[PDB]
Amino acid sequence: GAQLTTESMPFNVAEGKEVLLLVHNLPQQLFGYSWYKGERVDGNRQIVGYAIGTQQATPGPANSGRETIYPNASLLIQNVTQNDTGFYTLQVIKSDLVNEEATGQFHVY
Ligand code: NI
């Protein structure tokens, strides 16, 4: 069980380009992922919830229509704006609801 980690790719993203939040060390027995704007799980800043089983991505309140969650939890943010700079928090939701979070930073220039 390696620590769940996100890595923004690239860390520094040109405005209007894309960043992929890479997800390292997804745990086993997963149900879904959730991405949040900011440094914590906060449903109000939730970008997307992703049901692994049904492969359904549901936008949360922070979804800007630019975010693509992949089945590997990685988050694609396209057409990055200057307001995208900052932290992103993945929650990995496990079937047992013993969930893990990782943050999650990139910088738009
Ligand atoms: Ni800057």
Coordinates of C-alpha atoms and ligand atoms in Angstrom, one line a residue:
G1 CA 0.0 0.0 0.0
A2 CA 2.1 2.9 -1.3
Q3 CA 0.8 6.3 -0.3
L4 CA -1.8 7.7 -2.7
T5 CA -0.2 10.7 -4.4
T6 CA -1.2 13.1 -7.1
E7 CA 1.3 14.8 -9.3
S8 CA 0.3 17.6 -11.6
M9 CA 1.6 17.1 -15.1
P10 CA 3.0 19.6 -15.9
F11 CA 3.4 21.4 -12.6
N12 CA 3.6 24.6 -14.5
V13 CA 1.0 24.8 -17.2
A14 CA 0.8 27.6 -19.7
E15 CA -2.6 29.4 -19.6
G16 CA -4.9 27.7 -22.1
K17 CA -3.0 24.4 -22.0
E18 CA -3.7 21.2 -20.2
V19 CA -2.6 19.7 -17.0
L20 CA -3.0 16.1 -16.0
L21 CA -3.2 15.4 -12.3
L22 CA -1.5 12.0 -12.2
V23 CA -2.6 9.6 -9.6
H24 CA 0.0 7.4 -8.1
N25 CA -0.8 4.4 -6.0
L26 CA -4.5 4.0 -6.3
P27 CA -5.5 1.6 -3.6
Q28 CA -7.4 -1.6 -4.5
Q29 CA -11.1 -2.2 -4.0
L30 CA -12.2 1.2 -5.4
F31 CA -15.6 2.5 -5.9
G32 CA -14.9 6.0 -7.2
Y33 CA -12.9 9.1 -7.3
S34 CA -13.6 12.6 -6.5
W35 CA -11.6 15.6 -7.4
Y36 CA -11.9 18.8 -5.6
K37 CA -10.6 22.3 -6.1
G38 CA -8.4 23.1 -3.1
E39 CA -6.6 21.3 -0.4
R40 CA -9.4 19.2 1.0
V41 CA -12.3 17.2 0.3
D42 CA -15.1 19.8 0.1
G43 CA -18.3 18.9 -1.8
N44 CA -18.7 22.6 -2.5
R45 CA -15.5 22.7 -4.4
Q46 CA -15.9 19.2 -5.9
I47 CA -14.9 19.1 -9.5
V48 CA -16.1 15.7 -10.3
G49 CA -17.3 12.4 -8.8
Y50 CA -16.4 9.3 -10.7
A51 CA -18.1 6.0 -10.2
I52 CA -15.6 3.4 -11.3
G53 CA -18.2 0.6 -11.8
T54 CA -20.6 2.6 -14.0
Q55 CA -17.7 4.7 -15.4
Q56 CA -19.9 7.7 -14.7
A57 CA -18.3 11.1 -14.2
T58 CA -20.6 13.6 -12.5
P59 CA -19.7 17.2 -12.2
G60 CA -19.6 18.7 -8.7
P61 CA -20.1 22.4 -8.1
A62 CA -16.5 23.3 -9.0
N63 CA -16.7 21.6 -12.4
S64 CA -16.0 24.2 -15.1
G65 CA -16.6 21.8 -18.1
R66 CA -12.9 21.6 -18.6
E67 CA -12.1 18.7 -16.3
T68 CA -11.9 15.1 -17.5
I69 CA -11.5 12.4 -14.9
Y70 CA -10.0 9.2 -16.2
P71 CA -10.7 5.7 -14.9
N72 CA -7.2 5.8 -13.3
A73 CA -8.4 8.8 -11.2
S74 CA -6.1 11.2 -13.2
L75 CA -7.7 14.5 -13.7
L76 CA -7.3 16.3 -17.0
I77 CA -7.9 20.0 -16.8
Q78 CA -7.9 21.5 -20.2
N79 CA -7.8 25.2 -21.2
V80 CA -6.3 26.1 -17.9
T81 CA -7.1 29.6 -16.8
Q82 CA -5.2 31.7 -14.2
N83 CA -7.8 30.7 -11.6
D84 CA -6.9 27.0 -12.0
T85 CA -3.7 27.6 -10.1
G86 CA -3.6 26.0 -6.8
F87 CA -4.5 22.8 -5.1
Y88 CA -6.5 19.9 -6.2
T89 CA -7.6 17.1 -4.0
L90 CA -8.3 13.7 -5.1
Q91 CA -10.4 11.5 -2.9
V92 CA -10.3 7.8 -3.7
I93 CA -13.5 6.2 -2.5
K94 CA -13.0 2.6 -1.6
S95 CA -15.9 0.1 -1.4
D96 CA -15.3 -0.1 2.4
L97 CA -15.4 3.8 2.5
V98 CA -12.0 3.8 4.1
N99 CA -11.0 6.5 1.7
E100 CA -7.8 8.2 0.8
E101 CA -7.1 11.7 -0.2
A102 CA -4.2 13.2 -2.1
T103 CA -3.4 16.8 -3.0
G104 CA -2.5 18.1 -5.7
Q105 CA -0.9 21.2 -6.9
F106 CA -0.3 23.0 -10.1
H107 CA 0.6 26.4 -11.3
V108 CA -0.7 28.2 -14.3
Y109 CA 1.5 30.8 -15.9
Ligands
NI1 NI 2.2 32.5 -11.2

